[PDB]
Amino acid sequence: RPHSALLENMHIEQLARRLPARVQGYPWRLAYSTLEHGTSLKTLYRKSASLDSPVLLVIKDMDNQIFGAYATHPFKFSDHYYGTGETFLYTFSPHFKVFKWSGENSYFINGDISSLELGGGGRFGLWLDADLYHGRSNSCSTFNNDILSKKEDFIVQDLEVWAFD
């Protein structure tokens, strides 16, 4: 079993039970960490470039709340949305909750030069700036999610991207 600087053992177990069958039982491998690597979206893209695997995004904001996404595709720069229906958002605040694909649109993942976002329909379920510093979470139609953080706007304390290959 893995050790995360952000997820306690109980959180890892709750998340692992919600992963799709595609990666059930697969060991977790830490591909990008703001604690270990340069803190920037560019570094995240570069550390994701060799991944042959769906990925698990783990964010801890400056209020110590934990939330993120399971994405069917490694995070990459794009000029249109990508990802498919197994992508979901999750949060642990106030309690562990998963927001699966609603079927309403397929705006799962978009990697801009200056931001990474999941969800669409002008709200993003999850948005991170180019420094992985400012973030935002809104209810969006892709996932019909709750605001993943306390309020809409948050600050990343640290984040991790795990892979299964």
Residue numbers in the entry: 54 to 174, 176 to 219
Give the text the authors published on this PDB structure:
Nuclear receptor coactivator 7 (NCOA7) belongs to the TLDc [Tre2/Bub2/Cdc16 (TBC), lysin motif (LysM), domain catalytic] domain-containing family of proteins. The human NCOA7 gene encodes several mRNA isoforms; among these, isoform 4, named NCOA7-AS, is up-regulated by type 1 interferon in response to viral infection. NCOA7 and NCOA7-AS both interact with several subunits of the vacuolar proton pump V-ATPase, which leads to increased acidification of the endolysosomal system and consequently impairs infection by viruses that enter their host cells through the endosomal pathway, such as influenza A virus and hepatitis C virus. Similarly to full-length NCOA7, NCOA7-AS possesses a TLDc domain in its C-terminus.
Here, we report the crystal structure of the TLDc domain of the human NCOA7-AS protein at high resolution. NCOA7-AS has a tendency to aggregate and to form large oligomers as judged by size-exclusion chromatography (SEC). We therefore alternatively expressed and purified a truncated form of NCOA7-AS corresponding to the TLDc domain, hereafter referred to as TLDcHs, using E. coli as an expression host. A full X-ray data set could be collected and processed to a resolution of 1.8 Å. Most residues could be rebuilt for the six monomers, except for the first two amino acids of chain A and the first three residues at the N-terminus for chains B, C, D, F and E. Gly175 was not modeled in chain A as well as the glycine stretch ranging from 174 to 176 in chain F. Residues 146–148 were also disordered in chain F but were well ordered in the other chains. Analysis of the crystal packing with the PISA server revealed the potential existence of a stable complex made of three TLDcHs monomers within the asymmetric unit. The overall structure of TLDcHs is globular and consists of two α-helices in the N-terminus and ten β-strands forming two antiparallel β-sheets. The two sheets, organized as a central pseudo-orthogonal β-sandwich, are made by strands β1, β2, β3, β4, β5 and β10 and strands β6, β7, β8 and β9, respectively. The fold is similar to those of the two previously solved TLDc structures from D. rerio OXR2 (TLDcDr) and D. melanogaster TBC1D24 (TLDcDm). TLDcHs shares 62% sequence identity with TLDcDr and the two structures display an r.m.s.d. of 0.7 Å when superposed over 164 Cα atoms.
